[PDB]
């Protein structure tokens, strides 16, 4: 059995329990659900406009999942230095150790401040996630389907960039499942792909093609926490880890 304990050959005395730092620091760290609610950087992108965008056209999209995105180090010339150097963060390091999840997510998208244009945000729970490839932030090209535009019935919110350039969200668990998958996802079953991400958030600017030039190559950073309903269910052990301070230094 795993956690069996045959003969405890104890040489120790009693050690005074601090209450996971409650006695020293005034706060307990036993519950790992409340450490998961500290906001972690989810994604990081430069706004790259390809074709002439209408007011409806979504600037970028991303599938919304607590597992972390398919990790974008970046191009081999210009790497995103946090996901290159500070690999994976905390929430998929804890969600790496579980199998199922049932709950909500929070996002707090941070926009550039040079832009002024009004920003809409759609949650689209219809969208299936076709594999861990393209489980990432997609700078959208010219519109071919209803994926690429503002849509009607889905839950949206419009942040005014002139008042405050951060929209803060609560993306609900709108799946027809018991719980969703939490590791990396290869999409074996065709309906299994309805059960990975909570939905598919698309952020779009309402600017015309004359104000679209101030938008180009400005950073948009996304955060996430797990929003008080998140319950990771089945214990699955961790995979092989990589130690970060053994990564090579950029030799001059």
């Amino acid at each position: 059995e795993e956690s069996r304990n045959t003969t405890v050959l104890d040489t120790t005395t009693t050690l005074q329990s601090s209450g996971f730092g409650r006695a020293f620091f005034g706060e307990a760290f036993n519950d790992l659900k409340t450490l998961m609610r500290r906001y972690q950087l989810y994604g990081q992108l430069l706004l790259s406009v390809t074709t002439d965008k209408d007011i409806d056209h979504c600037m970028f999209t991303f599938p919304c999942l607590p597992q972390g995105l398919a990790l974008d180090i970046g191009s081999a010339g210009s790497p995103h230095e946090i996901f290159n150097r500070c690999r994976d963060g905390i929430i998929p390091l804890i969600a790496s150790g579980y199998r199922f999840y049932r709950g909500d997510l929070r996002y707090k998208i941070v926009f550039p401040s040079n832009v002024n244009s009004n920003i809409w945000v759609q949650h689209r729970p219809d969208r299936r996630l076709e594999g861990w490839s393209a489980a990432k932030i997609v700078n959208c090209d010219a519109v071919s389907t209803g994926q690429g535009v503002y849509n009607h019935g889905y839950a949206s919110h419009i942040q005014i960039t002139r008042v405050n350039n951060v929209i803060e969200l609560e993306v609900p668990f709108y799946n027809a499942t018991c719980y969703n998958y939490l590791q990396a996802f290869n999409a074996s079953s065709a309906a299994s792909s309805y059960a990975v991400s909570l939905g598919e958030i698309s952020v779009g600017f309402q600017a015309t093609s004359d104000d679209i030039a101030s938008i180009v190559n400005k950073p948009v950073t996304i955060y996430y926490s797990i929003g008080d309903g998140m319950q990771f269910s089945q214990w699955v052990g961790y995979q092989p880890m990589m130690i970060l301070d053994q990564l090579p230094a950029p030799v001059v």
Binding site: E1, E2, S3, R99, F100, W132, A176, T177, C178, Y179, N180, Y181, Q183, A184, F185, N186, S188, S189, A190, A191, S192, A195, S233, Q234, W235, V236, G237, Y238, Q239, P240
Partner: protein, 250 residues
């Protein structure tokens, strides 16, 4: 204490485990490992059809794997990656006959969807002088994960709960697997929204933690036999048997 008196009947006490018409005995106490608490029934939410567990036939034991575990098998070595709701059917189709020939699996031929628990007994028949140790680990939805090809080692399945089958004790591994899939039913056949990966709850996989060790004239091989019960089942969606296709050979 410690009064050995063997007779013609033998020494120890033999424990049983009776089902419908299958009794299988073990001398040794099992190393039970239960990865989740027992599942609720859940036919209320998604089925108006007549639902019935066929516990007089489905809850019998049935051998689904037997394999020689030699000393030639190294340390980090798979022995059987059994996909257990599939392996009950693919073992029968590996016996070169249909699913309707076995009493345990005739409602898989008829019904469309299944939800139930699974008992697994991974019995070993090693000698007392052999030294080695297996682990039997259940992973929920192996094939819905793509980095499991790197997790699949004895260091990674020792972290989740698992059974240990020591070759000295000739130990037996009870393994109670309740139903935890994403969707509350597993289809037995090609269903409209998924066709690939049918009846795949996960993988029982049996790695080696210590290989067999012995003398030069010791018994080399070691046979391992895996039995499965399907106890707290329920079948729904009565359908024709001609829509059931054969499982993938694997």
């Amino acid at each position: 204490m410690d009064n050995p008196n063997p007779g013609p009947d033998g020494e120890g006490e033999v424990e049983l485990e009776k089902d419908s018409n299958v009794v299988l005995t073990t001398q040794r106490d099992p190393s039970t490992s239960i990865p989740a608490p027992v599942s609720v029934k859940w036919s209320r939410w998604t089925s108006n059809d007549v639902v019935d567990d066929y516990a007089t036939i489905t809850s019998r034991w049935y051998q689904i794997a037997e394999f020689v575990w030699s000393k030639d098998d190294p340390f980090d070595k798979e022995l059987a990656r059994l996909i257990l709701p599939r392996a009950l059917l693919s073992s029968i189709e590996a016996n070169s006959d249909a699913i309707c020939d076995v009493p345990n699996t005739i409602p898989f031929k008829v019904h469309a969807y299944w939800r139930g628990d699974m008992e697994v007994r991974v019995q070993i028949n090693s000698n007392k002088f052999q030294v080695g140790q297996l682990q039997a680990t259940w992973y929920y939805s192996d094939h819905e994960n793509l980095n499991i090809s790197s997790k699949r080692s004895v260091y990674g399945f020792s972290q989740m709960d698992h059974a240990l089958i020591s070759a000295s004790a000739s130990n037996e591994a009870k393994l109670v697997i309740p139903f935890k899939h994403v969707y509350p039913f597993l289809p037995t056949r090609i269903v409209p929204d998924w066709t690939t990966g049918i009846l795949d709850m996960g993988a029982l996989n049996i790695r080696v933690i210590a290989p067999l060790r012995m003398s030069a004239t010791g018994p080399t091989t070691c046979n391992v036999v895996v039995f499965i019960k399907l106890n707290n089942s329920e079948f729904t969606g009565t359908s024709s048997g001609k829509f059931y296709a054969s499982q993938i050979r694997a």
